[PDB]
């Protein structure tokens, strides 16, 4: 509060000194089921080159 | 992996040998895979005779050769060998064999079939 002021000396009253937020725990990412990966086990497991 | 041999065991002279080597483990698809066929008299060395890989190269033993068909029936997973005009020296047995892939170099009869004493008589 004396921050606010800029005085040693706050007067009897209520002040808003600032405000609070509870900070994010956490962190996460969501994709999709994607499921469809491309033949490179064909053109590596070829059976003739 | 399985291999086992089948056809008539015992015909005269001047006639023909048939025999089928049906197979389990391998597929004449892949590559490195091959079969081939190895006959022994009795109490005698090992002899070649012809071996197929899995592109159909049909190699042939020379001094055999002239006198031998080998082919193979992928749909029925079996090959089929034959060998005309048969004789009573040549009663051995034989062998339907495996050669597939090693660790540096292709591995060659690792596998052996269980043989098919045949005799040429009367």
């Known amino acids: 509060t004396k921050c606010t002021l800029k005085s040693f000396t706050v007067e009897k009253g209520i002040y808003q000194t600032s405000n609070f937020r509870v900070q994010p725990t956490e962190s996460i990412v969501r994709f999709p089921n994607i499921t469809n990966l491309c033949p490179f086990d064909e053109v590596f497991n070829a059976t003739r080159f | 992996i399985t291999l086992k041999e089948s056809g008539l065991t015992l015909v005269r002279p001047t006639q023909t040998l048939t025999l089928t080597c049906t197979f389990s483990?391998?597929?004449?698809?892949?590559?490195?895979?091959?079969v081939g066929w190895i006959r022994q008299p009795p109490g005698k060395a090992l002899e070649w005779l012809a071996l197929?890989?899995?592109?159909?190269?049909?190699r042939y033993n020379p001094s055999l050769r002239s006198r031998l068909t080998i082919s193979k029936a992928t749909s029925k997973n079996q090959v089929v060998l034959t060998m005309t005009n048969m004789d009573p020296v040549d009663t051995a047995t034989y062998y339907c064999?495996?050669?597939?892939?090693?660790?540096?170099?292709?591995?060659?009869?690792?596998?052996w079939g269980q043989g098919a004493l045949v005799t040429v008589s009367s």
């Open positions: 483990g391998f597929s004449l698809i892949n590559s490195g895979v091959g």
């Open positions: 064999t495996h050669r597939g892939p090693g660790h540096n170099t292709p591995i060659y009869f690792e596998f």
């Open positions: 197929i890989y899995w592109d159909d190269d049909k």
